[PDB]
Amino acid sequence: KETPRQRMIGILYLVLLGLVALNVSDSILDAFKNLGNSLNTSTQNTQAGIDNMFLAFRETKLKENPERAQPILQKAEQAQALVQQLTSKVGELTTLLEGEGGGLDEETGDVKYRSSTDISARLMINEGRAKELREVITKTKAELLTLTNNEINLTLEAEDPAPRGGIKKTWEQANFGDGIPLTAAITALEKINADAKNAESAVVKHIFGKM
Amino acid sequence: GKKETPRQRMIGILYLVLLGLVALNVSDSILDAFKNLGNSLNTSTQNTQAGIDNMFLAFRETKLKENPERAQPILQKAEQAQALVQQLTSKVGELTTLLEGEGGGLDEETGDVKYRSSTDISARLMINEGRAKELREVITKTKAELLTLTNNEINLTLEAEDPAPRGGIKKTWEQANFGDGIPLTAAITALEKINADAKNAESAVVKHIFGKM
Amino acid sequence: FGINTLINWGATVVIIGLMFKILHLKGGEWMIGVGLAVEALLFFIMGFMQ
Amino acid sequence: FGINTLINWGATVVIIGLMFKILHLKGGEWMIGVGLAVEALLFFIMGFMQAEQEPDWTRV
Amino acid sequence: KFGINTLINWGATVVIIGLMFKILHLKGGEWMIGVGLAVEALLFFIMGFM
Amino acid sequence: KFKFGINTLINWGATVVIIGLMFKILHLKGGEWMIGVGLAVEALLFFIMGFMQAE
Amino acid sequence: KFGINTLINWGATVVIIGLMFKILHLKGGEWMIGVGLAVEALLFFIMGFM
Structure with missing residues (x-):
């Protein structure tokens, strides 16, 4: 015989387990992978837009007053190169993290070990690759702002998140740190690439709009 | 005192543990990642829309002037492609504002809504009330009508298909995007992702149509 | 086949x-x-017992 | 009523x-x-009710 | 033993x-x-016949 | 008739x-x-009763 | 001694x-x-033998 509390417990523990099981989903990681794919496609579109801007400027007002356009074109190309430095750095990091991913899983759609929570923290926090990436982000944002100093680049920013629960986090510990799955880290690198391309588009548009 | 069998004793222990896991919710860093991805998607989508506007302006100012007879139907078809996706874009906007409104106000400490880690707002505002199925029907219809408008390329970005069955279960698109275990910020980011996919598909279709002539 | 069933x-x-x-x-x-509605109702009823 | 109620x-x-x-x-x-508040209350109440001394049959 | 409790x-x-x-x-x-859950549900059904 | 122990x-x-x-x-x-x-106190109290006998 | 309760x-x-x-x-x-969770599962498996 059991007390009423024991019947309550012995019936509700399975309901609670069902609630807990329902409340945790692999769809978080599927969402991270799909967001990465969408960010990559939109970045391709943004790069196409930048190329169209360059072609437009190249035979709309460059052919008329080159003595005025050559400095503008040179500044735009310099901004392109500055952003490309960060773009290549992020590409190297993405290949590094995907190589240690563990081989693409065709059943899921992305890399195996996509939910490891430790590969990214072992390759970006332990060896400090994330700190170097953050320094590159900050340096390229500052150098982009130097060419304009007028428009504001609300994309390129390695700012630390506002503290919560008394504790404080750094940008590298927030984007690639502990608890971040490998798929989330690859998505974060793709986000940094998209932010760099958006900033490049903004600065190129402003520079070409100066004349 | 009172004696309880080991069976009941560790049912009690496991019951207390399972009560704790009810308070388990997604880590703050992951929700920050979702919010940041949504912001980046929004900005890239604005860049895509600007690119589409630039394509329209270039076509209607450069290639239309010299042969307006051969170009006017092409531009009308392109505009029709631009109107099919506005049906999806405006549908996603209303769902976005619906999820923000049930969000619970823009918390100032972070950059997003309160109850951003709910996992039960979008699971009842989109599945229980069947808004995700309507959205998926609109996505499929606009994908088909963009394809049947050209049928000369792939719009693989804009496709609301179920995830492949892994582990012996078959998750639906609505359930994998807005359902159980999906925080509110993840669902708002999913709507932002759908909007980005729609703009990307519209950009591809418009570019292809203008590339006909 | 009491209330326990x-x-x-x-x-x-x-x-x-x-x-x-x-x-x-x-x-x-x-x-x-x-x-769960049946379970809640049966637990409510069973509170009216010695 | 009682405590079982x-x-x-x-x-x-x-x-x-x-x-x-x-x-x-x-x-x-x-x-x-x-x-959860109710379940905390029942954990508290059961903590009291578990302290009742069962009748010791050492007197046999 | 391997009874019903197993x-x-x-x-x-x-x-x-x-x-x-x-x-x-x-x-x-x-x-x-x-x-x-299938096993637990089938056992819950069976123990209703007691 | 109430005695408080480690279980309470x-x-x-x-x-x-x-x-x-x-x-x-x-x-x-x-x-x-x-x-x-x-949770820390509960873990410690559960650890303690390992070093105990129940009759 | 150290029984199953331990x-x-x-x-x-x-x-x-x-x-x-x-x-x-x-x-x-x-x-x-x-x-x-694996230890609790193991314990549940273990006293299924009793």
Whole structure:
């Protein structure tokens, strides 16, 4: 015989387990992978837009007053190169993290070990690759702002998140740190690439709009 | 005192543990990642829309002037492609504002809504009330009508298909995007992702149509 | 077939509904509701006992 | 009534909270907290009720 | 012994391992919860005939 | 006829943990503090009874 | 001596520590809830033999 509390417990523990099981989903990681794919496609579109801007400027007002356009074109190309430095750095990091991913899983759609929570923290926090990436982000944002100093680049920013629960986090510990799955880290690198391309588009548009 | 069998004793222990896991919710860093991805998607989508506007302006100012007879139907078809996706874009906007409104106000400490880690707002505002199925029907219809408008390329970005069955279960698109275990910020980011996919598909279709002539 | 039988059978419906919901089957969201409402009603009734 | 009534109506409240949580009903966000408050109360009450001395049969 | 109590304990083992798999985002998490819940529901039905 | 032991203290530690859980779910202020304190105390009390006999 | 109650209580302390690290999002929270849940599952399996 059991007390009423024991019947309550012995019936509700399975309901609670069902609630807990329902409340945790692999769809978080599927969402991270799909967001990465969408960010990559939109970045391709943004790069196409930048190329169209360059072609437009190249035979709309460059052919008329080159003595005025050559400095503008040179500044735009310099901004392109500055952003490309960060773009290549992020590409190297993405290949590094995907190589240690563990081989693409065709059943899921992305890399195996996509939910490891430790590969990214072992390759970006332990060896400090994330700190170097953050320094590159900050340096390229500052150098982009130097060419304009007028428009504001609300994309390129390695700012630390506002503290919560008394504790404080750094940008590298927030984007690639502990608890971040490998798929989330690859998505974060793709986000940094998209932010760099958006900033490049903004600065190129402003520079070409100066004349 | 009172004696309880080991069976009941560790049912009690496991019951207390399972009560704790009810308070388990997604880590703050992951929700920050979702919010940041949504912001980046929004900005890239604005860049895509600007690119589409630039394509329209270039076509209607450069290639239309010299042969307006051969170009006017092409531009009308392109505009029709631009109107099919506005049906999806405006549908996603209303769902976005619906999820923000049930969000619970823009918390100032972070950059997003309160109850951003709910996992039960979008699971009842989109599945229980069947808004995700309507959205998926609109996505499929606009994908088909963009394809049947050209049928000369792939719009693989804009496709609301179920995830492949892994582990012996078959998750639906609505359930994998807005359902159980999906925080509110993840669902708002999913709507932002759908909007980005729609703009990307519209950009591809418009570019292809203008590339006909 | 006392009140205890309905305490167990009402749990069977809840657990089968949980099975259907977890396995992403078709009609499991209704069995959870019905079984849990029956369970709440039976626990309410059983409070009126010695 | 008694103390068993409290346990069973706490079971009813917790069941209703769990049902609103699982089916994503409108109030399920805080009714789970109400059920958690009730369950804390029953843990407290059972902590008292478990302290009752069973009649020792060392006198046999 | 391997009586009726063995099933209600091994069902708990199976459903708990399924919960562990689902929390860790391992593959067969949902399917093991399903089988454990099936066993537990079938035992709840049987114990109603007591 | 009431004697308090280690089990009563376990149930009260559980009460503290569950109040912490309610505070975390309802987004009240001091939620994680009670969760952590009560869970640590509950773990310690469960560890202690390993070194005990029940008749 | 160290009977089956000792195993239950130490599995309880292990799973509770794992739960504390999982809920509060501490350093190794993710795998400790796995080890903690595996010990409870193992105990449930074990006394299925009694």
